[PDB]
Structure 1
Amino acid sequence: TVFRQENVDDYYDTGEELGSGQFAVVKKCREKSTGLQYAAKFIKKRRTKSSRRGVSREDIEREVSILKEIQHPNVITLHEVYENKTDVILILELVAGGELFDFLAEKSLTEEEATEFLKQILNGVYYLHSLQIAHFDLKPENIMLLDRNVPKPRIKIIDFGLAHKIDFGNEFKNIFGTPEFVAPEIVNYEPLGLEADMWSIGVITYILLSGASPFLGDTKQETLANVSAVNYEFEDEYFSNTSALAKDFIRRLLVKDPKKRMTIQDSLQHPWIKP
């Protein structure tokens, strides 16, 4: 699939940089014809077949095709796609309130503050999983707020760069996600499905309530070894006033066997969440 090949700078002006990764940079932008503001994600293309730099066209097209399907209050919306010889440029909904990660560093959350965020995450993941879309990269960095100066900020899931459609209940690919948040089946190079996202939500919930990462080691290999062995515990120093039911929710997500892990529907019916 080909994208718009006119120069993006003829239709948008860019501003503040919003974020920067190995193969992409995101810049605030403004559409000249409407004054409306967006986030432009510039993805570096691969320059040869065998190269390891840049993102393969297959991977870029997969992300675009997923973004084109989704429309939900808790997921980013895609506006337009441009390309040139160097980059594919996704014009995405602007989410300007900052990361859940950075907002976390400002303060641990109470269970009410945590569940208010978590319920929005669960609602977005429920929508995705309903469409058989696995995100495969859920982590505080990919959860951003629309406005961080309200008592109950609204969140959006960003970054569909690892997301896959799961038409057969599992996909057999490598997911090089972030060690602290990937499920044991990713660490072990196993077939992957929607369950991997539910493990990541369990990790996110642990961090939201405690300020601490449950599997984090001193090196990436230690973190990955801890994930595979399900080597975590609730430290009393961090969890002593956290309810048992919040711990129960986490414990039913941080389950090695994906078949025994809570699904997204289970998580919404769990007594800690269900109203």
Structure 2
Amino acid sequence: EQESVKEFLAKAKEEFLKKWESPSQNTAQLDHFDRIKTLGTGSFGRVMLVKHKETGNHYAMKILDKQKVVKLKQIEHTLNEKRILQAVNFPFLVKLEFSFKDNSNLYMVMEYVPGGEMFSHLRRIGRFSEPHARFYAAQIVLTFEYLHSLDLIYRDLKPENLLIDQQGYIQVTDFGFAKRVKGRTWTLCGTPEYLAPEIILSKGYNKAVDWWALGVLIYEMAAGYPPFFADQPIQIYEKIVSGKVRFPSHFSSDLKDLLRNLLQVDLTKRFGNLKNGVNDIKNHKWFATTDWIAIYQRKVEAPFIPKFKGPGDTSNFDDYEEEEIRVSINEKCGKEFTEF
């Protein structure tokens, strides 16, 4: 690679490692914020729009219930998520602003991106044109080059985790499955339609799973549906492992060729995982129009700007029951979460 890229990534890794080795902790508290709206809710956590009472800034606060994290065997994953997020810095990664814990919950306070999930926009328009899909894909390629150079695997690429910001660029959110891995790792995680075959088959897998997931994402952006779609997970998994994918006739030949190379079942043949690494992707004809530096510098005009009224607008998110943020009188699971 150009010495320019090598030197950039060396500095990126140095800066990451300093924060990785000495993580920030306990940088705000709950009563510094007002709750505005619940933006998402799951089996062990929620995301809420909050406002800082002194500065007036809006943030997305992820709240994890310690007891449920333990019950669902997510302890290490939650520690990974926060330790990684506090240490990374890249234009297409959502910024962690504060973190803290209390007797009941873990809190990560992040930039709020009012444009909403790529998923919503994709489903509302049907499919993205190839230029539009390529603009987003280029951001993911650069983000994975950054993450992988820090020995990080992301492991949850899907349209719901990609927020569209005020300039129309992507912000990757949700580092719940991200992990620092030199070599292989084994945990079954991700989302069914996006899992690489080696995850399904319970192998020791590596960063090549992220490049597989990029193939799934690009297909879904350009087609409007994912390549291995089926009604139940087991049927999805059978399709993933089969080595068979069908492409819409509207796909360009270049798109089909790139996707066949990202969706290689044999991980030793998969683009992003060959001897030339990410450059096989960056140099592919489908990316011939992409100015990688201009994308990194946010100098390209985006395909669209989401419609929203301001930094507190929640219109691009959907409606959930509002539930308490209860804090027990007694500390729960203190030992498990000491490092948070």
Q: TM-score, normalised by structure 1?
A: 0.89
Q: Partner of 1:83 in structure 2?
A: 101
Q: Aligned ranges for residues 153-232 of structure 1 at < 5 Å?
A: 153-167=168-182, 169-171=183-185, 173-232=186-245
Once the 2 structures are TM-superposed, how far is the Cα of residue 245 of structure 1 from its aligned partner?
A: 0.3
- Rounded to whole Å, the distance in 1 between the matches of 2:287 and 2:57 is 36
Kindly name which structure, 1 or 2, has the bigger radius of gyration based on alpha carbons. Answer: 2
Aligned residues: 261
Q: Which structure carries more relative contact order (alpha carbon 8 Å, separation 6+)?
A: 2
Q: C-alpha offsets along residues 140-185 of structure 1, whole Å, 9 cap, x if unaligned?
A: 11111013xx7xx111111000001122x222x2232111001011
Q: Partner of 1:123 in structure 2?
A: 142
In structure 1, give the amino acid aligned to 2:26: R
Q: Tell whether 2:162 aligns with 1:143.
A: yes
Q: C-alpha offsets along residues 95-150 of structure 1, whole Å, 9 cap, x if unaligned?
A: 12111111001111111111111111212222111212110010111111013xx7
- Rounded to whole Å, the distance in 2 between the matches of 1:92 and 1:193 is 28
SS class of match (2:86): helix
- Rounded to whole Å, the distance in 1 between the matches of 2:249 and 2:165 is 32
When residues 209 and 262 of structure 1 are mapped into structure 2, their CA distance, relative to the original with a 3 A threshold, is: same
- Rounded to whole Å, the distance in 1 between the matches of 2:136 and 2:280 is 18
Q: TM-score, normalised by structure 2?
A: 0.72
- Paired residues of 2:26 and 2:99 also in contact (CA < 8 A): yes
- Rounded to whole Å, the distance in 1 between the matches of 2:37 and 2:73 is 23
In structure 2, give the amino acid aligned to 1:61: L
SS class of match (2:79): helix
Q: Partner of 2:47 in structure 1?
A: 26
- Rounded to whole Å, the distance in 2 between the matches of 1:246 and 1:41 is 36
Q: Tell whether 2:117 aligns with 1:99.
A: yes
Question: Which of 262, 265, 268 is equivalent to 2:282?
Answer: 268
SS class of match (1:109): coil
The CA RMSD over aligned residues, in Å, is: 2.0
- Rounded to whole Å, the distance in 2 between the matches of 1:192 and 1:86 is 34
Once the 2 structures are TM-superposed, how far is the Cα of residue 242 of structure 1 from its aligned partner?
A: 2.1
- Rounded to whole Å, the distance in 1 between the matches of 2:26 and 2:256 is 49
SS class of match (1:69): coil
Q: Aligned ranges for residues 243-258 of structure 1 at < 5 Å?
A: 243-258=252-267
Once the 2 structures are TM-superposed, how far is the Cα of residue 6 of structure 1 from its aligned partner?
A: 7.1
- Paired residues of 1:134 and 1:197 also in contact (CA < 8 A): yes
Once the 2 structures are TM-superposed, how far is the Cα of residue 240 of structure 1 from its aligned partner?
A: 2.2
SS class of match (1:156): strand
Once the 2 structures are TM-superposed, how far is the Cα of residue 91 of structure 1 from its aligned partner?
A: 0.6
Q: C-alpha offsets along residues 221-241 of structure 1, whole Å, 9 cap, x if unaligned?
A: 11112112233211xxxx223
Question: Which of 116, 127, 130 is equivalent to 1:111?
Answer: 130
- Rounded to whole Å, the distance in 1 between the matches of 2:279 and 2:149 is 10
- Rounded to whole Å, the distance in 2 between the matches of 1:77 and 1:204 is 23
Once the 2 structures are TM-superposed, how far is the Cα of residue 258 of structure 1 from its aligned partner?
A: 1.3
- Rounded to whole Å, the distance in 2 between the matches of 1:250 and 1:47 is 38
- Rounded to whole Å, the distance in 1 between the matches of 2:190 and 2:96 is 22
- Paired residues of 2:90 and 2:143 also in contact (CA < 8 A): yes
- Paired residues of 2:49 and 2:59 also in contact (CA < 8 A): yes
Q: Partner of 1:62 in structure 2?
A: 80
- Paired residues of 1:133 and 1:165 also in contact (CA < 8 A): yes
- Paired residues of 1:45 and 1:55 also in contact (CA < 8 A): no
Once the 2 structures are TM-superposed, how far is the Cα of residue 2 of structure 1 from its aligned partner?
A: 9.2
- Rounded to whole Å, the distance in 2 between the matches of 1:266 and 1:162 is 26
- Rounded to whole Å, the distance in 2 between the matches of 1:23 and 1:212 is 28
Structure 1: gaps spanning 5 or more residues: none
Once the 2 structures are TM-superposed, how far is the Cα of residue 266 of structure 1 from its aligned partner?
A: 2.1
